[PDB]
Symmetry: C3
């Protein structure tokens, strides 16, 4: 919490809010894998069409078989899903996510079936994008990623002359798409039908259609530029027909809300100069604060904006008692690893002010023409208008115009290395010292046990002396 933690060299670089998922707006798409070629054909065969159909069908066999095993067999069983999830054993061993996704799958069964009910019209229609319609109502959108390119190249008629050439252009168009499909449909998981469709997969699958579909299916105020460039869009396969080669995907757009009393701070670190060496604090690069509570929170899998971080689920990791204390101001509990600093990690601008390691890097001020030096008592030296106005950090001059407002104590036992190999070597060293301490103990024990025995002899002598003084005292005393 105490950002006064930048005396050490760790500077906050961002403060975003945390958004969670409340509900989701959806849309159904039918990916038409086989394009429409309705021009008459005689005395000629277009082999590429056959091959594409065969290779793609085999490629989709796992998704299909999984779909049947789950859907068309153990959950909706020759009847109509009424809301009770049954036979989840069908999934074998599944994660919470997969189980969640399976339920969503059966819940979508009725819509997927409505759309697949029109598979035939969808196939006969030549179109890159098209509204799947049933008597005055839109079920969703039907897309075919290669249709436009195909229409540009197909001959109005395919005769025995055209043949060779046509089978070639259609061939390369289909095969290129096929190849990209190969990139997305690999049979490795047990329930592939339940794997999420990423925006990258959607791009491959929908080709040049993605933009059009993105707008056509969502009415939110969010622009098509955001949906495409961010990672909010995510979909899942909800239906398949291998004969018409049509895949029904359900796309989803999250409805993000902000979680109160929670911030997600980014921490960067410049090299400090402590106890005679260039070092760098060792802390998480992204933390989450909720009052006094602090967790590590890298949103590598979340969508990040300049002022917000939207995450599917919580990815927080617990920090160590020593780490927290260090973030909460207590700098004697931090940890610094030595480093080979460079220009890029020796300084940083922070709202006009510049924080830098002037001990490791030459902070040669120009206007005041005075070379800045750094007290061995200060890890990092600040630099505002007061200390300079036109500073020059090796090959880079620039003015300074702001002013910064506002006890140090660092033990060299805080300067360690956090590297497996390095740690194991120190561990070995510590262990050898424990072994020396144990030997010292043995030596020590042996000696004390020897004194105890001499003490015994000494007592046996005191007695005899004592008794001898009692007798000699019987020739003059009682």
């Amino acid at each position: 919490d105490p950002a006064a933690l930048m005396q050490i060299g760790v500077i906050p670089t961002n403060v975003r809010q945390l958004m969670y998922y409340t509900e989701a707006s959806s849309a159904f798409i039918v990916v038409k894998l086989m394009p429409t070629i309705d021009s008459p054909i005689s005395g000629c065969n277009i082999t590429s069409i056959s091959s594409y159909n065969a290779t793609v069908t085999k490629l989709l066999q796992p998704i299909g078989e999984n779909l049947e095993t789950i859907r068309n067999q153990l959950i909706p069983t020759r009847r109509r899903f009424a809301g009770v999830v049954i036979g989840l054993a069908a999934l074998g061993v599944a994660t919470a996510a997969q189980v969640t996704a399976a339920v969503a799958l059966v819940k979508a069964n009725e819509n997927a079936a409505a759309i697949l009910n029109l598979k035939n019209a969808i196939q006969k229609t030549n179109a890159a994008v098209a509204d799947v319609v049933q008597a005055t109502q839109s079920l969703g959108t039907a897309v075919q990623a290669v249709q436009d390119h195909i229409n540009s190249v197909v001959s109005p008629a395919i005769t025995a002359a055209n043949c060779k050439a046509q089978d070639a252009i259609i061939g390369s168009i289909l095969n290129l798409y096929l190849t990209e499909l190969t990139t997305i449909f690999h049979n490795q998981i047990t329930n592939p039908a339940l794997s999420p469709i990423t925006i990258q997969a959607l791009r491959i699958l929908l080709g040049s259609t993605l933009p059009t579909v993105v707008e056509k299916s969502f009415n939110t105020q969010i622009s098509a530029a955001e949906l495409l460039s961010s990672g909010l869009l995510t979909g899942q396969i909800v239906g398949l027909d291998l004969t018409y080669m049509q895949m029904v995907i359900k796309i989803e757009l999250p409805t993000l809300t902000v979680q109160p009393a929670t911030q997600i701070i980014d921490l960067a670190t410049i090299s400090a100069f402590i106890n005679n060496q260039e070092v760098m604090a060792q802390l998480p690069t992204r933390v989450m604060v909720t009052g006094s509570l602090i967790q590590a929170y890298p949103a590598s899998q979340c969508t990040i904006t300049p002022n917000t971080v939207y995450c599917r689920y919580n990815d927080a990791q617990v920090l160590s008692d020593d780490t927290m204390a260090c973030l909460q101001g207590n700098l004697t509990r931090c940890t610094f690893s030595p480093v080979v600093g460079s220009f890029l990690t020796r300084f940083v601008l922070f709202d006009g002010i510049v924080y830098a390691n002037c001990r490791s890097m030459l902070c040669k001020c120009m206007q005041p023409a005075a070379v800045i030096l750094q007290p061995s008592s200060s890890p990092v030296t600040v630099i505002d208008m007061y200390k300079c106005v036109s500073l020059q950090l090796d090959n880079l001059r620039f003015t300074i115009t702001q002013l910064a407002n506002v006890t140090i104590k660092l033990e060299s036992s805080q300067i360690l290395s956090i590297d497996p190999l390095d740690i194991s070597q120190n561990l070995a060293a510590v262990n050898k010292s424990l072994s020396d301490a144990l030997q010292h103990l043995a030596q020590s024990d042996t000696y004390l046990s020897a004194i105890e025995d001499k003490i015994e002899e000494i007592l046996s002598k005191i007695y005899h002396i004592e008794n001898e003084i009692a007798r000699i005292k019987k020739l003059i005393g009682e």
Copy 2:
């Protein structure tokens, strides 16, 4: 053999696969014709983009070409018909077993590669994206040209002073786009580039829309082109090159897998658990190989995975510690738990119809017997089969449970809080510094302690003396009487 009943700790076997080794392999030769054929007549015009493309690509292939020449037409076959053993390997400088292996293969494919480049003229004259290279009614391999179909599509029937500007432009963006991708594969960084493996990813860039056709046409295997294209099975290596004709000969190889008996590759996932008053997660390898009583960490990140099989070139196993083995072998007092920030996605798992959840860290609201499932401290994880709940609700997710478990909680769980620690470097280093600090005090305390000891030795020599004199003084006083 790994009590899978290590599930009481929250680790669940999510997969069991067979391991497969690569006995032999089938291969085929491909000639990548880098220069498109253009037959439409040219007159009163000069397509320059073709000149540039030729120049840039020839440079980009100089390193591979030079290397290929040095090894081949220079030192390994020694420009003398190979015999059976390789000679002159010092030519490679420093090489790894994988590279030497490839070098040996290079010279072995020497004969075939020659046969193919021997037809570089015909191969180049022929306009075709894919064509069979033939000699004496035999097929030596396949000839591909990734852009041909596209070029053919755009190039006009006759190029003339009128077209020139527009034709050169389209033929240019086409060749240039290919060039860019190609420039993404051939970067000279190593000392022996001609020996670097060609991946399916590079193979795709190199062959373009031609890949599916080639894959099908090169092997007859039962495996489908879909498996071949979508798996990582296929691999290739350069074994021929003619910079003049810009034709690169490549040898593609498809393995012939075999099931190594008595071996399984198990995937291990962990849900969080509640132990000694904290939400923790067991720390173990995520993928182990098992053979008898031997367990090794087997991260097959370099292999081809199937729902039932794992196949690798060479095993990438890692040895596990005695404690970690003890743990997976069933001795839970040896496992290691790290505290974690649980979430819905990590507090339960479905295992063949029965659920396994951390009902302390999560609200397991049973719906049928309408009760809140309470998790006793002596259970880091609860099991929920039909007998405990026929209708369960887990945070907005409701489902039925109609399968019965098989009681094996015969032995109570013995777990010490010392098993709960962080396995993260930073955290480990801090702990080590604490340990060391504690030991340094002891080492100091022993040094001072070593002083109160030197004092005793003294007060003892004093006593032994005063005693020696008191004895003389007594016998003296005694002899006087």
Copy 3:
């Protein structure tokens, strides 16, 4: 300096390369026309795509523009001609050196930027993939349109109400593919988007089929277009942008390389060895920098590598521990080995004709001199040169050794078993917990040995007291008797 007698340990030098520092960098400007030119006449027809593409590419470039403004158009130049001062940096909020460095370079190029962004119309109205930007017999750089050629092939000579739907479809997919790729480069995540660098990856997406042409045209160095495109030497930054004309001015920068006199960058590979009865591997860094007697880990993950050279903008070196340095310098008693599961691929190496192999873990069968090479426990690795074997066979691999080794240099290999341990975090923590348990017992046992020490000192104090009385009587009975 670095006994390669580190080879007796199975760690071998695979590459020695020179290091190179980036001195000066010759630049060049590029104007990216994000909108193609359709000159053919249009009648009664709305090419819908041109509108949509435009609305989208624009909201996409808003962040880069908005930010690029608050910086250039509002807080560094300030409605006036720059004068080498750089004020108002506070506008960047918190910014790193690389960013600040860029903000400087931005305002510095502002002049050339606006110059180009002043020939908008000439650029827009012109129809070409690659167009030289000129102003009074001078090249201000190059203007480029990634999709132009393609569009020209497609676009009909005259777009009518009959061609419409058809044309809007072809043109529309061409633009949308490009738009999609652009959606891959321009996500708004940072605070100063405009400052983020442009990679050859981003560059490729942006200029498409143009890149090879632009590159060769705007640089006259000895480096071939091939290398500039294959390596990672090229970089650029967004200097000028105009949302209305959809033109982005970019500054491509090609670095001038300068060798660091003494430094050398060595790559270390390790084969398994057989030490204290088990197969293991030495735990050293993979790439190190060596200058005289200083050694640092040098992972040039970013840098541009060549068979003989390594060029980086700034260092990425890491400090090595004393034990690691001692090991790298020949003191093998300080190295660290980890038991491993060996494989063919990691059991041997060819070093200038001579093979180095673990012949305990692998069967080193000599073919010509016909014999099986045995490796004594004392040799963690064996060296097979021509003197030992002419034709060797390492299962399936059969080759000839024609070189001789002379590195017969002798030095006793002293290796303690405490050098064989795991470097895996989980394993380290398990070991640290055991060391802790001992430290724990030692401390309790110490508590006790502190109790005796007091009790011993107690009976001593007593003895020394009884020796008082006994001493007075003997001095009394000595006088009261004379």
